[PDB]
């Protein structure tokens, strides 16, 4: 018999992004080919199968720094981190391959799906 | 020129609630008249003007335990904590006064608004 507030989840995510932009309560640095990205472990876990596995590990959950595979493109990661905090994906002809490869590695199934569909349309 | 994934914010919140239910990466205990509630500081801040003010304070941001005012009803708090993590509010004739008082104290403006409207309809 609950009532539901339609905009609540969007408002929560908008506020989490405001905390990220002001570097408030960020508890991890993600290192991608020397580029550094500050974020909230819980948001990373909520969006990515890879971060979910990393931060549920009894040793890695306590790490303040995570180094990604050197094949990961920092721009691809940046676009995906922005998507995690906003639901918006800046998908362009010039970045689609790097974004799809990064989403496959991060295990972000819905992003992988739209990249596959956009690539299939261009062939 | 971004594309947007409609269900992303809801999926993030659903995953944050799964982390809460399994007590994963919770970093604060909220004490309400001896009852204890574990939660994520970032989610509390994203939903409440009161928690936003508390955890942006340079001393309180480091506290692992927060004690609420003794007038706060634990059931009212529990209903609001569930709403924070799900967008669903269990508003009933028997709890509406405690829920509204708790939402006013927590500074959750949309919850206060619906409580005022439901109370006005019953008079």
């Amino acid at each position: 018999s609950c009532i539901q507030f339609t905009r609540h989840a969007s408002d929560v995510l908008l506020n989490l992004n405001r905390l990220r932009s002001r570097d408030i309560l960020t508890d991890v640095v993600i290192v991608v080919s020397r580029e550094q990205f500050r974020a909230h472990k819980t948001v990373l876990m909520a969006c990515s199968g890879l971060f979910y596995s990393i931060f549920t590990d009894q040793l890695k959950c306590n790490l303040s720094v995570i180094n990604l595979d050197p094949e990961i493109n920092p721009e691809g990661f940046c676009i995906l981190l922005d998507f995690m905090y906003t639901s918006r994906l800046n998908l362009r002809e010039g970045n689609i391959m790097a974004v799809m490869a990064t989403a496959m590695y991060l295990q972000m199934e819905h992003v992988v799906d739209t990249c596959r569909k956009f690539i299939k349309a261009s062939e | 020129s971004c594309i947007q994934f409609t269900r992303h914010a809801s999926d993030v919140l659903l995953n944050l609630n799964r982390l809460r239910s399994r007590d994963i990466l919770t970093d604060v205990v909220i004490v309400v008249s001896r009852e204890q509630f574990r939660a994520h500081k970032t989610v509390l801040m994203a939903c409440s003007g009161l928690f936003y003010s508390i955890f942006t304070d340079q001393l309180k941001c480091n506290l692992s335990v927060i004690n609420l005012d003794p007038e706060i009803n634990p059931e009212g708090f529990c209903i609001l904590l569930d709403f924070m993590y799900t967008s669903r509010l269990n508003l009933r004739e028997g709890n509406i006064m405690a829920v509204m008082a708790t939402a006013m104290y927590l500074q959750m403006e949309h919850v206060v608004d619906t409580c005022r409207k439901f109370i006005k309809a019953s008079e």
């Binding site: 009532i3 539901q4 507030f5 339609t6 | 619906t114």
Partner: peptide, 4 residues
Amino acid sequence: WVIP
């Protein structure tokens, strides 16, 4: 607010 809606009936979910």
